[PDB]
Design a binder for this molecule. Sequence first.
Ligand SMILES: NC(=O)c1ccc[n+]([C@@H]2O[C@H](COP(=O)([O-])OP(=O)(O)OC[C@H]3O[C@@H](n4cnc5c(N)ncnc54)[C@H](O)[C@@H]3O)[C@@H](O)[C@H]2O)c1
Ligand SMILES: NC(=O)c1ccc[n+]([C@@H]2O[C@H](COP(=O)([O-])OP(=O)(O)OC[C@H]3O[C@@H](n4cnc5c(N)ncnc54)[C@H](O)[C@@H]3O)[C@@H](O)[C@H]2O)c1
Ligand SMILES: O=C([O-])CC(=O)C(=O)O
Ligand SMILES: O=C([O-])CC(=O)C(=O)O
Lengths: 338, 339
Amino acid sequence: MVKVAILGASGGVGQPLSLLLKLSPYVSELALYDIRAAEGIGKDLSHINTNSSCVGYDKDSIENTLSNAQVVLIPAGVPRKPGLTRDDLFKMNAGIVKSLVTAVGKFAPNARILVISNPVNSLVPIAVETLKKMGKFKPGNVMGVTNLDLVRAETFLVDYLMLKNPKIGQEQDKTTMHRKVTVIGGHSGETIIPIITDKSLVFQLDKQYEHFIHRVQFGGDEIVKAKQGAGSATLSMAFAGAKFAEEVLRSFHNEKPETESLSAFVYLPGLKNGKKAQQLVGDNSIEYFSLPIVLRNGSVVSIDTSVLEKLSPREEQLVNTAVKELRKNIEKGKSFIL
Amino acid sequence: MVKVAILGASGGVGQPLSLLLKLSPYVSELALYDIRAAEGIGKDLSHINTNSSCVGYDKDSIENTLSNAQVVLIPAGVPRKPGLTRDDLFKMNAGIVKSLVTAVGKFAPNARILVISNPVNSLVPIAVETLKKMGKFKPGNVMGVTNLDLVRAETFLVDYLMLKNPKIGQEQDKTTMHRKVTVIGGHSGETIIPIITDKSLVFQLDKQYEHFIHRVQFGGDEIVKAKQGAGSATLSMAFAGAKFAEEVLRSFHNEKPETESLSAFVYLPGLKNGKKAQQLVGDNSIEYFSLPIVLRNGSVVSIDTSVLEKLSPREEQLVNTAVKELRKNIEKGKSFILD
Ligand SMILES: NC(=O)c1ccc[n+]([C@@H]2O[C@H](COP(=O)([O-])OP(=O)(O)OC[C@H]3O[C@@H](n4cnc5c(N)ncnc54)[C@H](O)[C@@H]3O)[C@@H](O)[C@H]2O)c1
Ligand SMILES: NC(=O)c1ccc[n+]([C@@H]2O[C@H](COP(=O)([O-])OP(=O)(O)OC[C@H]3O[C@@H](n4cnc5c(N)ncnc54)[C@H](O)[C@@H]3O)[C@@H](O)[C@H]2O)c1
Ligand SMILES: O=C([O-])CC(=O)C(=O)O
Ligand SMILES: O=C([O-])CC(=O)C(=O)O
């Protein structure tokens, strides 16, 4: 059935991501690539008694890694650290994503590409425009992994209900809260739009609602601070990213997604209902948004816009703020490569 | 239901181990402790949408880490390195285990203590002899985690079958192969004893038997070599360690273990059928061996000796060489405390 490659497998995200993917029953080969250390990490994980073969490859061996792959996860990139501006991160990461995605376009042009590298809002456009340049772009096959934002929302909605109201918070199970909240937009504090779909819950949060919003939005900053400068979220990204990959993998075996309204940052003009999404977010030419997606054989075949149809006034304002930032993020991406 | 603490949570083994423990439905509170970085790693994991509450703690907060902990995982240690002698490696890890186990004795004396630190064969006797001296030693509660040996055995059994007979290789599920192989003894190449139960797997293996047996025993080395001196097994360890802790945690909630003949390195004299095990291994005073255990409520209540009762002439030969070296491993640990 399905070969997964992981480009950037040896990093803080990449190792535990590789570990979690070795545990997936949907994977048949697992290939790990990095500029260093991947062969040892693959060997390490090949001892695990799950059915997948796991090989890591050296820095000169991206082709062996990619050849025949159906899904390509990209945790490669440079993470936030104290000596580094957003613009530093943007340019270094843009080079990485370009080379790795050019490698995909040459060695496995049909694979579903799941981009973890940050800034997702501008690097996804880099991915797409690189593939378009190559004549290799399939819009269903390029996904910005924004699912860590959904993981946080689920977690924080329970943690904020516990605080306000130990009554209601008892009955909440963090593992199933995706029934009650959906995250859309982009992946930065200006662009993350948490949409509580259970309107009762919005009211029960009361004055903790605005804190909840802010917490989901700035979760990235929170871990950077916790890790005392040197480090960003790694382990929980690995988790979120493997969860998303597992939905993409499910969809090769004709199975229902476990997350209701699973979102990824996708190219609206190439996907069904993208034009309706554009209108619904108030901007007729915006090219990318993180929105709930429908998967078949690991490709996005439609966008489900339901969550855009019942926005509160407050949420409309979050959308508006997101759109204006996103337009700039996208343009910075496209123009770095055009 | 249960509070879990991880001492050494920021290391190569500890971070992935902590992530897997965050995903356990059996855990109420997950507490992480290291000489460095454990607070950020706890915060990172706290964002994961599973029900456990995860908090990390600085080097001076082992007190709050251990308070009400019922299960303590110890991945803290120094791993193998291109530089280090056997004896210098031992010295460093001995101090770390004595020190962390003392704190357990002081702040969570009832906890089930799961020792991942290596050398397991000597570090588990150090934890016991530390606890005895404090008057806080319960034999059911100290377990050297040897589960990675089982994991490799399961996996190399299939890898080796494939290359011999693909018809049968392909028939196997790497994941449930703890019904067809059980590992006993110690955790080192001289002490690991893979008992292929289901015998006709041994004849298909043919001259790949001695090759397989050796692959399992020297798994650690293989990773050290594959990581080109700079690290040992981490992620597979976190996996094998987390599975093992899961069986421990599972036994708190009236559930059968998922792993048949689940082994761990335990103190024979303090344990039901421990005497029977010593006889069956051909050493009446050997105080430690990794053997299938029965867990009631986190604690080892008996040793199941079945697996020693029926042994090939080759398997008794493996028991023999393991016991000789284990005596020295156990003495090397006991004397570190009994000095
Ligand atoms: N999408 C999200 O929600 C989210 C969350 C957390 C982190 N991130 C991002 O994920 C990325 C990785 O973070 P980390 O903490 O794992 O960083 P890291 O520096 O620990 O690891 C990145 C890895 O990428 C590898 N790499 C670099 N260039 C490469 C190339 N050309 N080919 C293959 N591999 C290469 C490095 O060797 C390293 O092993 C960062 O860009 C970070 O901003 C995204
Ligand atoms: N049982 C097994 O089968 C098995 C398998 C693999 C590794 N190991 C062993 O596990 C240990 C960990 O290896 P690793 O690769 O994670 O090493 P590492 O060096 O990556 O991790 C060691 C961690 O232990 C911490 N530590 C040291 N002293 C401490 C103390 N007093 N209190 C709290 N934390 C402390 C360090 O700060 C670090 O975060 C080693 O001894 C290694 O050989 C055992
Ligand atoms: O904040 C960062 O740089 C990494 C990230 O995307 C996150 O944790 O959300
Ligand atoms: O070999 C080492 O040094 C670490 C270990 O215990 C293993 O991988 O089995």
